[PDB]
Amino acid sequence: ALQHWRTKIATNGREWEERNRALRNEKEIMARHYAKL
Protein backbone atom coordinates (compact mmCIF):
# COMPACT_ATOMS: atom_id res chain seq x y z
CA ALA A 1 0.00 0.00 0.00
CA LEU A 2 1.03 3.70 0.11
CA GLN A 3 1.96 3.21 3.81
CA HIS A 4 4.08 0.15 2.84
CA TRP A 5 5.84 2.22 0.12
CA ARG A 6 6.55 4.97 2.71
CA THR A 7 7.98 2.29 5.06
CA LYS A 8 10.21 1.01 2.18
CA ILE A 9 11.48 4.59 1.51
CA ALA A 10 12.23 4.98 5.26
CA THR A 11 14.17 1.64 5.27
CA ASN A 12 16.14 2.85 2.20
CA GLY A 13 17.04 6.10 4.05
CA ARG A 14 18.10 4.20 7.19
CA GLU A 15 20.36 1.89 5.08
CA TRP A 16 21.85 4.99 3.32
CA GLU A 17 22.74 6.45 6.74
CA GLU A 18 24.15 3.13 8.04
CA ARG A 19 26.38 2.63 4.96
CA ASN A 20 27.76 6.14 4.49
CA ARG A 21 28.69 7.31 8.00
CA ALA A 22 31.29 4.64 8.80
CA LEU A 23 32.81 4.77 5.31
CA ARG A 24 33.29 8.54 5.53
CA ASN A 25 34.75 8.21 9.03
CA GLU A 26 37.29 5.60 7.92
CA LYS A 27 38.18 7.70 4.88
CA GLU A 28 38.82 10.72 7.10
CA ILE A 29 40.95 8.86 9.66
CA MET A 30 43.27 7.25 7.17
CA ALA A 31 43.42 10.51 5.22
CA ARG A 32 44.84 11.98 8.42
CA HIS A 33 47.32 9.09 8.32
CA TYR A 34 48.15 10.13 4.74
CA ALA A 35 48.74 13.72 5.85
CA LYS A 36 51.10 12.65 8.64
CA LEU A 37 53.09 10.42 6.29
Partner: peptide, 20 residues
Protein backbone atom coordinates in the same frame (compact mmCIF):
# COMPACT_ATOMS: atom_id res chain seq x y z
CA UNK B 1 11.02 8.56 -5.67
CA UNK B 2 12.32 5.03 -5.15
CA UNK B 3 14.27 4.82 -8.42
CA UNK B 4 16.16 8.08 -7.94
CA UNK B 5 16.87 7.46 -4.26
CA UNK B 6 18.20 3.99 -5.07
CA UNK B 7 20.43 5.43 -7.81
CA UNK B 8 21.72 8.11 -5.43
CA UNK B 9 22.41 5.45 -2.79
CA UNK B 10 24.31 3.34 -5.31
CA UNK B 11 26.49 6.08 -6.77
CA UNK B 12 27.23 7.62 -3.36
CA UNK B 13 28.47 4.30 -2.00
CA UNK B 14 30.44 3.41 -5.12
CA UNK B 15 32.14 6.82 -4.92
CA UNK B 16 32.94 6.10 -1.28
CA UNK B 17 34.45 2.72 -2.20
CA UNK B 18 36.51 4.02 -5.13
CA UNK B 19 37.91 6.88 -3.05
CA UNK B 20 38.70 4.34 -0.32
Amino acid sequence: RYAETDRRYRDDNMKLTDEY
